[PDB]
């Protein structure tokens, strides 16, 4: 994908794909991550931003109602819990009590099946910071039956260290460790090669403990 | 440019360029428009969005402090007016009373020179919906002395009619009348050619009075 945003300790990527929720999770995991969480309105905005990039980058995404997996699920055996915002669902990597939600409609009051969540974009309407993607809950899909209106997925990757973007007159292009490559990253994950051209190549490395930088005396160019 | 957003009746484009404010205005005007206004927080968000696209599209934009003209100026002879948000400045195409502003620092209390305004991005920080571009006021530049830290400009184009995006399985790519071409436009200006590929070509035309559509029976593909 070319759709990537990195801010602070987190990177997010949006992919097109007709994968089941398990398969999409396996795609993010192979890369060092997980299906994205949406634990706050601010996180929902990051995810909206990467999806918006995907739509600009992939002209083939034209399906009116388009859903993208995120990492929120309710296990078979657990009933809806309408005492909290997540309704009894929990995030990949643990958590059932974050304060934000954006549920599309009434949720199925079932205790008997696994429920997964996707972000619904109606590609007939503008994609604005004011109206964040709605959450749609449903069956989790299976190999070669991904689910109705599934068009893709959003991954999240977290790191303990990141480099600030490489300063310079000329052009720079970072290539992250989750095998995305791109330009204009707001934070660059540790172990990320950069590719400059005033073409110098550098890695993001830990110098002193918890100090991460490019190791380049003389802002180049 | 590839940086374009169209929403409702308005399109915005962001350009890189070391133009004076007069030259930048002449560039937008040649194309049917003007330097962009920022009349509301919602408009500031559209402009931030097109600038963010420019930064993703143009790897050469690396100057730490980067300013982009908008269409707000105070004429020689007119003093600062600190009784309103725009401080005595007025928009291209008229207006001195809009409610929004985001001034960077204290403005020069001068009555004797023309003052122009640009949006300041500090390309060392993340570009987030929470912290919109600051407004920086200064001299308006001249041919081959554009002004310090001027890196580009933002244009706005307004239309009385727009088409909703062309519905479909396959890919679509609109080309606007201000000679930008692109995909994923949220509104498409009247007289805009679209270029499809399931490669069918259509124009955005007025059918009944104030009715605008692509004129294509049978959602193609």
| CATH H-level, domain A4-158: superfamily | Mannose-Binding Protein A, subunit A (3.10.100.10)
The residue of chain A with its CA nearest to that of B6 is: A126
d(CA B156, CA B14): 9
The dihedral through the CA atoms of B115, B116, B117, B123 has a sign that is negative
Query: For residue A23, what are its two tokens?
Result: 């398969």
State the count of interchain CB pairs (< 8 A) between A and B: 65
d(CA B146, CA B150): 6
- Resolution in Å, one decimal, please: 1.9
Contact at CB, A45 and B169, closer than 8 angstroms:
no
Cβ distance A221 to A40 under 8 Å? Answer: no
d(CA A27, CA A19): 9
Bridge partners of A115?
A74
Question: Which residues neighbour A123 within 8 Å (Cβ) at sequence distance 6 or greater?
Answer: A55, A61, A62, A63, A64, A65, A66, B165
Which residues of chain B are in CATH 3.10.100.10 domains? 4-158
Contacts of A125 in chain B (CB under 8 A): 186
Cβ distance B116 to B138 under 8 Å? Answer: yes
The residue count of chain B comes to 221
* Best residue in A4, A45, A129 for a mutation probing chain B (most B CBs within 10 Å): A129
Characterize the bridge pairing of strands A171-175 and A162-163: unpaired
Contact at CB, A60 and B171, closer than 8 angstroms:
yes
Helix (H, G, I), strand (E, B) or coil at A56: helix
* Best residue in A56, A123, A124, A162 for a mutation probing chain B (most B CBs within 10 Å): A56
The sheet carrying B171-175 orders its strands as: B181-182, B171-175, B193-197, B201-203
B187 touching A (Cβ < 8 Å): yes
d(CA A186, CA A14): 17
Contacts of A60 in chain B (CB under 8 A): 170-171
* Best residue in B66, B184, B187, B198 for a mutation probing chain A (most A CBs within 10 Å): B184
d(CA A178, CA A165): 17
Identify which of A64, A129, A172 has the shortest CB distance to residue B59.
A172
């Amino acid at each position: 994908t070319e759709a990537v945003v990195c801010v602070g300790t987190a990177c997010y990527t949006a992919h097109s794909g007709k994968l089941s929720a398990a398969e999409a999770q396996n795609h993010c995991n192979q890369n060092g991550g997980n299906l994205a969480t949406v634990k706050s309105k601010e996180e929902a905005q990051h995810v909206q931003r990467v999806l918006a990039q995907l739509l600009r980058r992939e002209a083939a995404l034209t399906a009116r109602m388009s859903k993208f997996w995120i990492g929120l699920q309710r296990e078979k055996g657990k009933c809806l819990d309408p005492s909290l915002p997540l309704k009894g669902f929990s995030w990949v990597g643990g958590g059932e009590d974050t304060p934000y939600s954006n549920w599309h409609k009434e949720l199925r009051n079932s205790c008997i099946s696994k429920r997964c969540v996707s972000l619904l974009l109606d590609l007939s309407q503008p994609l604005l910071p004011s109206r964040l993607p709605k959450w749609s809950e449903g069956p989790c899909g299976s190999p070669g039956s991904p689910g109705s209106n599934i068009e893709g997925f959003v991954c999240k990757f977290s790191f303990k260290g990141m480099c600030r973007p490489l300063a310079l007159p000329g052009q720079v292009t970072y290539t992250t460790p989750f095998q995305t490559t791109s330009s204009s990253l707001e934070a660059v994950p540790f172990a990320s090669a950069a590719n400059v051209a005033c073409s110098h190549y550098f890695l993001c490395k830990e110098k002193a403990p918890d100090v991460f930088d490019w190791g380049s005396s003389g802002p180049l160019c």
